[PDB]
Design a binder for this molecule. Structure first.
Ligand SMILES: [Cl-]
Ligand SMILES: [Cl-]
Ligand SMILES: [Cl-]
Ligand SMILES: [Cl-]
Ligand SMILES: [Cl-]
Ligand SMILES: [Cl-]
Ligand SMILES: [Cl-]
Ligand SMILES: [Cl-]
Ligand SMILES: [Cl-]
Ligand SMILES: [Cl-]
Ligand SMILES: [Cl-]
Ligand SMILES: [Cl-]
Lengths: 268, 258, 260, 260
């Protein structure tokens, strides 16, 4: 099943869509600057693109920076849309936020941590917007159908499943490449995308992991990069250096183009 | 570090406290009847007891029973407290709930899935109530120190750490019995309790697992019962065993291996 | 199902048996000295005791110490048995070793890393000796019935199942305390014992872990001790075992409670 | 580091080599028929090829078919080499087997289950043959360096590291795609290959898993087939390999990008 996000076609047998940006909104200028680089690179290479950012980071330490908030975040997203003409994605945290965020933001994201909170799921469903569901590290690929069921019952079937790794002992994640296939098979072939950033604790391996994931035939890649850099723990420890964006994406796109040009081979 | 909950002294070198009750409040009478059974059994045996129940089930299906809700829930807890003269514990899911729930409920519980929601942690901290922190299946015993830090930063140090198992592959949980010690050593010897019910698959294994856990020298046992859950009629036979073991473990000085 | 080892009754509802000793044999004197400490303490407390040691360490690095070897190892074991009149246990690594080792050693042990080696299982089985099966970190409790079936087919039912923890991510073990019961239920209630030593992170945690395991109602406890792989400090042996026994006596004094 | 195996260049930046064959040798006839198909397909597509088979299955249940055995096994291998002029690979289980197996078989394989058995490692190293090290499901990628160090100490540096998945709870494996990079970085960029067959549960997932692995830039792919739970249907080999080769050629055409 494909989903339409404005001009973009999202689906497991379509050219991959980049859901790309930064961990959290810092300011209007930094946002436009970082977004512009993503927009120029994506236009150059011909990759469908949706700008990603959180306006709030609700797990942040008490007196540490957590974002700009809902009011100024939505203002920044409005400007990104007006300036670049692209779709955007952000995450929602309380049921009340859903309708107003859904007015501006084209895709609304269910945090992995809140993935089981029924009122949030219902509230998101009611908006009618495309929804990105982050798969929790503690949930099996087959347990995702229950979240999908819940959304369907609440009357919204435009769902994206986003992989971010699974708990592997203490203080460690592993990405089960077989999980992509299980989610395709058991959730009606909804678009599946890969959050390579949050599957990682360091950036050196980001390309190898991304390429492996995309080799499995996916609707898209979800990725964060540094902005106008805030070094000491501000951008996320696995964020890609922004200047490498082109060199990175050119390889992802070449791989994706190859996989998608070959018909699906059933092994029976 | 010991914590006072009315007359109860809760601590890792104190007689174990039973955090016992049901999954969700359904009706006043049903709650009173089941609570009465716990109260009678625990007073008979001489085990400090705190009655547990949720007033809402925020994660259950659209097509399921989701509880009596806050307003009704608090009324029931008020009645439980007045009738039996015991403390109670419930979970909270939203910052705005904390102050009203904390007016009635002696212990307020941070749900595992919300363990890292800062706004909730702050709102719970501000009540000044004793807090029960549910340890998520995906967090290491070391990572728990970070939640404890948040609470301290928010001005509340009356914290309980509650073990409920850790993720072990897909759809399976294992309880790392070493994690109790790691939490004790790294989180300032705050009270550690064991949620045996949510650690389990089959109820058949509940005594064996509860005894294993309590053998590591813990402040309390957290369990649910039903007339998954322990059958309510077996509560006395079950508690006799836990108490015998707890009393034995606590009668022998901590043997430090070095 | 109980197993008799000379005058010892080993079983999941009998007083726990201590399988205790050292990692590797080094010399006669040192072996007698350490066994003497164990024997003194276990005789005093009234705990059935079986002395454990390897004669070989086949995974050790090339330039590391490996033990005294088979021939010298058996002589030491003969001497240990002669002096103290207790049963002994050692591990075997090759089919040919099984018969001569079994003539001397009361319990022979299948190493975790070789637990699936059919020819080794067959040769151990044929001795008719009591066998201790070390559960591998990568095997589930229900996969152990496959090892048990193998011993049965080869004609030996005097089997002990020995828990030592399970792979938990990279570089960590966790002991699933529920696994004891699953092995009890699906492997015909064979004696289950707990290797607390090879389960462990740092020794400091040995008492807490041993007590947790024994709380589940087990046939025995398996530990190694150090000079004073985090073995127990030898000078703490008595204080340690007083607590294990006290707990084991309490658990065993109460009839099994079926939860239904 | 590259390894020469006859005319084949094996390395993490060379065209991928296929280590392909069957679980176990049953007869010469059946071996030749299956190998013939591999040879034809790999020749047509231009993929370097090494035929794989075990002559023995040391972990099978007692009365399951265990393979033809060493003597008959080496004869079959000799005929494979004579008929097709290709290199071959097989696994060894005892030190005494190593020199005679190494005479015939170009690559000798250390089983996952025996990975830490020092005597076998040493006996394998002394042959001077190319060695495939199977990574155990319970060893971390950084623990592999210790096996490599042993082989280096015992005189052999022609080593291949073979991924086959890691323990993930009970009776489940996961392949950590990051492990390939970690092995390359910490073990001197030795050739790393991927056993998709043993990593798997249902054969339906074989292509996706294999492509994912090879996307990480590897020296080779390791698989079993069968005319027709995990083995690839022999008739799909061409279609399968067309896709692996297309992905491999692309990845290997692009300069390594280090994220800095
Ligand atoms: Cl995110
Ligand atoms: Cl956050
Ligand atoms: Cl998560
Ligand atoms: Cl990482
Ligand atoms: Cl609860
Ligand atoms: Cl719930
Ligand atoms: Cl949880
Ligand atoms: Cl060893
Ligand atoms: Cl093991
Ligand atoms: Cl193999
Ligand atoms: Cl085998
Ligand atoms: Cl293995």
């Amino acid at each position: 099943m494909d989903i339409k996000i404005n001009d973009i076609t999202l689906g497991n047998n379509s050219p991959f869509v980049l859901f790309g940006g930064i961990n959290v909104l810092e300011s209007l200028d930094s946002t436009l600057q970082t977004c512009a680089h993503y927009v120029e690179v994506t236009r150059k290479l011909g990759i469908p693109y949706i700008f990603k950012a959180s306006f709030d980071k609700p797990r942040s330490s008490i007196h540490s920076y957590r974002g700009v908030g809902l009011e100024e975040g939505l203002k920044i997203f409005e400007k990104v849309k007006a300036e670049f003409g692209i779709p955007v994605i952000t995450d929602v945290h309380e049921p009340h936020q859903c309708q107003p965020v859904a007015e501006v933001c084209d895709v609304i994201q269910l945090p992995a941590f809140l993935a089981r909170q029924t009122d949030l799921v219902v509230a998101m469903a009611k908006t009618g917007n495309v929804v990105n569901i982050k798969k929790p590290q503690f949930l099996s690929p087959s347990q995702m159908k229950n979240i999908v069921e819940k959304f369907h019952e609440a009357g919204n079937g435009k769902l994206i499943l986003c992989e971010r790794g699974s708990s592997f002992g203490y203080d460690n994640l592993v990405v089960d490449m077989l999980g992509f296939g299980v989610m395709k098979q058991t959730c009606g072939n909804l678009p599946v995308i890969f959050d390579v950033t949050h599957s990682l604790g360091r950036r050196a391996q980001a390309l190898d992991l991304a390429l492996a994931g995309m080799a499995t035939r996916l609707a898209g890649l979800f990725l964060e990069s540094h902005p106008d850099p805030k070094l000491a723990k501000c951008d996320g420890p696995s964020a890609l250096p922004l200047h490498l964006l082109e060199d990175f994406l050119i390889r992802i796109k070449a791989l994706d183009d190859l996989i998608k040009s070959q018909p699906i081979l059933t092994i029976e």
